[PDB]
Amino acid sequence: MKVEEILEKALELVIPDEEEVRKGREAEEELRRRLDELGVEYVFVGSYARNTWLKGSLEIDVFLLFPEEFSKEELRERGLEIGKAVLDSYEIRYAEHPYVHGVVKGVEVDVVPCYKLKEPKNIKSAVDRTPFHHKWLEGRIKGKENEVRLLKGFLKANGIYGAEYKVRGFSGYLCELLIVFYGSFLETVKNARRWTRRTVIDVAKGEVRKGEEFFVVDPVDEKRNVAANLSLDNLARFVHLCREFMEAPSLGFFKPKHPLEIEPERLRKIVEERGTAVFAVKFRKPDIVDDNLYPQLERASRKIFEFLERENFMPLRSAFKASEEFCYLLFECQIKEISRVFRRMGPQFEDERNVKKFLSRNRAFRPFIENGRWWAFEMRKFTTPEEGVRSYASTHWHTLGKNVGESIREYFEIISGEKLFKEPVTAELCEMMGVKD
Amino acid sequence: MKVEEILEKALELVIPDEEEVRKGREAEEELRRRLDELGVEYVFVGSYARNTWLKGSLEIDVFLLFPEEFSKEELRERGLEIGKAVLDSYEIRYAEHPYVHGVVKGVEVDVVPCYKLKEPKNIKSAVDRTPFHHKWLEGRIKGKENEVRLLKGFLKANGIYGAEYKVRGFSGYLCELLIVFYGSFLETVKNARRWTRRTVIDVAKGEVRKGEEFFVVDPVDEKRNVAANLSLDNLARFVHLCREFMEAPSLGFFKPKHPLEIEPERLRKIVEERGTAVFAVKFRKPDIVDDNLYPQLERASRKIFEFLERENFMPLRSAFKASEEFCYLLFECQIKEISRVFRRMGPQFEDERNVKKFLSRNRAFRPFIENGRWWAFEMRKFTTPEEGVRSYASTHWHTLGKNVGESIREYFEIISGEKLFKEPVTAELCEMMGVKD
Ligand SMILES: [Mn+2]
Ligand SMILES: [Mn+2]
Ligand SMILES: [Mn+2]
Ligand SMILES: [Mn+2]
Ligand code: NA
Ligand code: NA
Known part of the structure; x- marks a missing residue:
């Protein structure tokens, strides 16, 4: 308008x-x-x-x-x-x-x-x-005070105001720098349509240039990136939001999105159509502050994600949520069940001593040679991504963040299906699967 | 003894x-x-x-x-x-x-x-x-005539006598060269325990040395590898058989193995335990000679194997069989069913024009940014390895060998389960899965 x-x-x-x-x-x-x-x-x-x-x-x-x-x-x-x-x-x-x-x-x-x-x-x-x-x-x-507020407001309504680790968005100082640099909210938005992951905004020099990462140079100290906590993905989102805004401007960019709040039945249908395994790791929230918790949840959820990739369950995406009492690590995988049998790599045919060792182990099926090398059929200990993660979280909790790991060591649960919909995770699941309104 | x-x-x-x-x-x-x-x-x-x-x-x-x-x-x-x-x-x-x-x-x-x-x-x-x-x-x-026969006999009882492409084993000429080189069957076997994929046997120079591939130098023509048709895997098998023979010698190395001939019920159990998808592509055998057919069957079966890898069905092994009337391409995959939804990669967030194209396509779920790049949830056209191959063989038969492809174009069938056991493939399946006696 x-x-x-x-x-x-x-x-x-x-x-x-x-x-x-x-x-x-x-x-x-x-x-x-x-x-x-x-x-x-x-x-x-x-x-x-x-x-x-x-x-x-x-x-x-x-x-x-x-x-x-x-x-x-x-x-x-x-x-x-x-x-x-x-x-x-x-x-x-x-x-x-x-x-x-x-x-x-x-x-x-x-x-x-x-x-x-x-x-x-x-x-x-x-x-x-x-x-x-x-x-x-x-x-x-x-x-230019109102320009700053317009910018803070635009960022907040789209979930990217705040440098704290729950957000990894834009700090207040950064927003005020940007307004001084470009002059207004609208010039900030117009120009940010061309930002890249290599853009250096040098406020004190009145200059934009290319370097190695997104870097907003603190006019007070030239070694300091004012945007150090802005994540690559939120930079990306901002840039795209700025393009969308200039293409079809609207008040709704300064309003939060009327949330999804979908009912279990639609989610059941969606999961069924997608044909994935959807599950969560539930455990008790450690009593630490946000800036400590959220990096741990990110690491735990990354570690389990990489486990699932490495174990051929083909994870699509993951997400995490902290409630008052519990945390949740959420996953969706393309593979609901894998075969019990798998190929274990052995030695080159030449290596006599090591072939002898490989061939010593009692197995149910005979090893075989392929492309000059021995291989054996062996048996997995789990065949679903849920069982895999039960096993991984029970054994490798030590790698899931200091406090996140210690809590999981004490108690965790894998949640799937109708039970998963009893927990406060539906909104996160929807977003993780790209569910439309 | x-x-x-x-x-x-x-x-x-x-x-x-x-x-x-x-x-x-x-x-x-x-x-x-x-x-x-x-x-x-x-x-x-x-x-x-x-x-x-x-x-x-x-x-x-x-x-x-x-x-x-x-x-x-x-x-x-x-x-x-x-x-x-x-x-x-x-x-x-x-x-x-x-x-x-x-x-x-x-x-x-x-x-x-x-x-x-x-x-x-x-x-x-x-x-x-x-x-x-x-x-x-x-x-x-x-x-040394009997030495040669002992060697030919050893190779034949283990399926590796003949340079023709159905066998890719040892030719008669090669066997006679070997006997001249080492003097006897037994010295051939003792020395072949140290052969590698780089061993050069130079018969006319009375010399063994290292080069780039297994090469037996024709005393008549030094550019000719007498072992050109010996496959890497049969070389490997020979070397290992020679080690096993010297470790525990036995008449049974000159006898073929009393074959498996297992009944459908054991195979059903084995497949169930392994938890794989086991299936075959059946089609009419083209009327060409062996040295032409077998390279085509190898290529067809390789192409489908690579398709199945590329499509994340995780093939374990493949094999092929020609009968009088039909050929069979046989597969076993770790994934029986994959999700309908998959990730399609889009452009970097910077690339405005191409993001716009990616975001134009109507889809059921919203695309998303991850690590600086767009991605979209899209839908597979098949969810089992059997459906995949129906689709691949129907469309890409042209790549499956001149005559093999043209036959498949005319007619092919995917066979699974109890029907697969009505075809003359059981022996091949057993060997492909390493079924023990
Ligand atoms: Mn304060
Ligand atoms: Mn500073
Ligand atoms: Mn002849
Ligand atoms: Mn010659
Ligand atoms: Na474990
Ligand atoms: Na097709």
Whole structure:
């Protein structure tokens, strides 16, 4: 309905509501009042400070700015003493070093100790870049705050906003960089139609060029890829979404898709038509944070996938899901049942000693020569992909992630058929099979 | 029971019987009387002339020796005019050029026109080497005639005597060369335990060395591999049989194996236990000679084998059989049924035009991105190896040998299960699956 008018409407899906802005205003006035009362040097950073934050994602970040001659333990103790005193409630989470993540008057706050520094090239972590991120962006992003939100909003409605490992999408900083680079949401989208897996966006040089991987060069530090956590597949998806948008623009690109919620009977039909084996490994969710869990689920599900390939069950795709209590590793394979008999490779006919060993083993059928080499018929211990994985998970849990493996060691189940539809996995199965609306 | 005594007993399985020797004597006296009466220059060649021939394989070869100044058509006409006049019954078969293959007093004779030549390096075909083969071997093989028979006999009882393509084993000439080289049957066997696929036996140099393939150098012509038609797998088998013989010698190595002749019920059990798909392609045998048929059956059966591999039915082995009326191509596959759905590869996400084409095709499920590339779920047209081959043989018969293909084009059948056991293939199936006695 004309791009200019669709963007206007999306601004209402994207700009946070009234009581949200003023909920942040008073948590920002309370927090100032507490820190000011204590004499701490501080700075508000992140997207709240710049009025670029998405509707629904209100977060205040405050960095404590402590003189360059403070030790690595003295800043770690003192910095958290102020975080106790300033927050309604406090805890010590870790991004790399400890930092207080709590609440003030109903609003998430992160308090972070870090060196007071003028000029970068004098920093230690991802934490010490942040004040410089903010400084670099403040003023350049003025007038363009709504563009950022439109971009964050576009990404979020399509499941690719957030650099955390559950998402492996676009961070807020990345979105603000992009807007500074291209000028607007719409120019970002138009230009991203030509991005490749080798595109280097060098923001500080005003330059796009080719290199080895997708890389957005941090204007604060030229060694840092701001898009380091963006996965290749989400880059691909973004590029394609940008092409689709410019081809037939629509408000629905800023709305989440009315989900599938199909009933067991359609799924039964679909599975029957496809003629695959569909099953899940179920086990108890380890009590670790997301950024630790999701890489483990990815590795577990990859390991089982490779086992199934190697064992000739021809896996099509796999997926994984964490619920409150359980995790699920989900698979679909082209082979529902393989023969009991298989070929085991023996030695070249020349190698007398080793042929003798190969021929010693008692078997039910006679070995044979083919293309100059011995081979023997031997028997598999499992004939379905479900039995295979029972066996693999029982024996090779050690390879399925530190905590994922240890949980599976304690308890796991293979689920197929009508039982698989009693678990909260239907949505994931549908997506994994490309089920249409 | 001691090697020396086993060899003595085998000599009775190997040296032709009494009425066989004198059946050849009188066919050799009749034939001389006919050619002598006509004034033809001739020479008896082959293993009859040297008393090296196996029990059961009585064959007289006579080569007509015509002056060096005879044309290539004048020797072809005249040479066959004498073959009509000398044989009870005559026909013109082809090894490379025409030659009369008929009978005299109940005995196969080949009459062959060829140039009368002193010194080789003045020859045209495999035919002109033969007189020189005989000349080179006559005198060197005296006293060792029984050794040759023992060797021919050992090879024949194990299915590897004959260079013709149904066998791809050891020719008579090769066996006589081997005996001259090593001196005896037993030294041939002892030394062949060390043969490799790279062994060069250079008879005229009294030398064994390494080269690129198994090669027995013709003492008459150094470019000629006397073992050219020996297959790698039969070489392998011979080597292994020679090892087994020296390890536990026995008369039974000169006897054929009391065959399996298993009944349908055991085969049903075995197939059930193995859990494979076992089937055959049946069709009418083309009316061509063996050396033409068997390479075609090998190619047809290889082509279907590769189709089944490529289509993920995981073929274990294949075999083929010609009966009087039908041929059979036999297969065993690990996959009895595959899913209807499969992954079709699309383009890299970057390639806008080609992604658009890939995404245009109407399908039942949505395509998806994985590792930077598009993929689509699509549907197979067959889900069992039997259906696959119905389809392949109906469409790609042209690739299955000139005559084999044309017959299959006219009529073929896929046979499975109880029907497969109504055909004369059981012995071949058993061997292909390594069924034990
Ligand atoms: Mn924060
Ligand atoms: Mn940075
Ligand atoms: Mn002959
Ligand atoms: Mn020769
Ligand atoms: Na196991
Ligand atoms: Na076809």
